Amino acid sequence: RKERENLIKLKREAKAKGGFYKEPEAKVILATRIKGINKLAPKPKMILRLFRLRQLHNAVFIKVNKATIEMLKAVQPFITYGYPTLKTIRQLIYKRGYAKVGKPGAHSRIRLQANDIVSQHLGKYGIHGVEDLVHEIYTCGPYFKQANNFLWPFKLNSPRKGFTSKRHGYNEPRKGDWGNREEMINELVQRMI
């Protein structure tokens, strides 16, 4: 609440001067996969495995570097990504939140019913409860990589009102789908739950 209120007071104060407040660029994005398995060039096929996007209607939280942007250029037309909010992150981890549990070889994919699963695996890093994941993803903490790779990638159902046209970008005035929506992926993913 306080950083939301403090964000407003900054860009009111700077507006009273003369200038404009350039906002902080978003540290996490939320990819979703849109086109399926068949007919994929072998470089785009690799990148989607590196994001753990192995089938249709799969979400994943993914970090923003210069590196991770220049991966997403190559994949764009198989993907609809963008910037989450605290509502949609809470809704994902509560409703669709599963967690991967075991050695290299087999991990099991377990439903987040209690904090003791989260506690034993991430109790090194803080992160004892389910609510401390939601902080570490939304803020992007120092232990994002650990907390993200704990979560088995999200398995969303098909959006209640449908897509427009998965050929075309979300930009273009045919109102298509692929590419990145800065915020409006939040309106999509709330239907895919």
Binding site: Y21, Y170, M184
Partner: protein, 182 residues
């Protein structure tokens, strides 16, 4: 409750980016542009496309500061618009000047993409509306505008085909309908 069906979902947006600071060239010159678009995102897309034609700038080399939504001042009453635009025919490019009448600028540009597609087959991608100024009645130069101007204007309702609300509709009726109405 307000009917979604009549209008297109255009909204006007101001945009302001500024290129990007460098050690050679600190504090660049700032930009500004009014645009029409679906959304706060798709305005920024159209900003970088148009700014690429003017000046040596890109989305990677640029930085955007503010996306202000603009609306009408007073949307209650009717006003004349002189829209300037360009589009791309299968031969080449042509500038136009159309004149449209509605309550809002958003209502005019919705009405124009309908009109422009319908006549000239101009696709959404090609059209770029340059500026949408408000015009006095004694200013519009088009003849289809001029007939409307003048107080005491009257228009008789002729041939009254009513779109019946669904459920009102029945496949059979007795009487045969009445279209002159009176």
């Amino acid at each position: 409750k307000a009917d979604p069906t009549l209008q297109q979902k255009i909204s006007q947006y101001q945009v302001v980016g500024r290129k990007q600071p460098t050690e050679a060239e600190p504090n660049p010159s700032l930009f500004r542009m009014r645009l029409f678009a679906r959304n706060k995102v798709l305005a920024v897309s159209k900003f970088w496309y148009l700014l690429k034609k003017m000046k040596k700038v890109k989305k990677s080399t640029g930085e955007i500061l503010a996306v202000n939504e603009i609306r009408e001042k007073r949307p209650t009453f009717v006003k004349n618009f002189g829209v300037w635009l360009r589009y791309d025919s299968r031969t080449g490019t042509h500038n136009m000047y159309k004149e449209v009448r509605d309550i809002s600028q958003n209502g005019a540009v919705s009405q124009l993409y309908a009109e422009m597609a319908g006549r000239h087959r101009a696709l959404p991608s090609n059209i770029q509306i340059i500026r949408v100024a408000e015009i006095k009645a004694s200013q519009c130069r088009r003849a289809h505008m001029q007939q409307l101007f003048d107080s005491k204007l009257k228009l008789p309702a002729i041939r009254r085909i009513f779109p019946t609300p669904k459920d009102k509709k029945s496949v059979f009726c007795a009487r045969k309908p009445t279209l002159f109405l009176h």
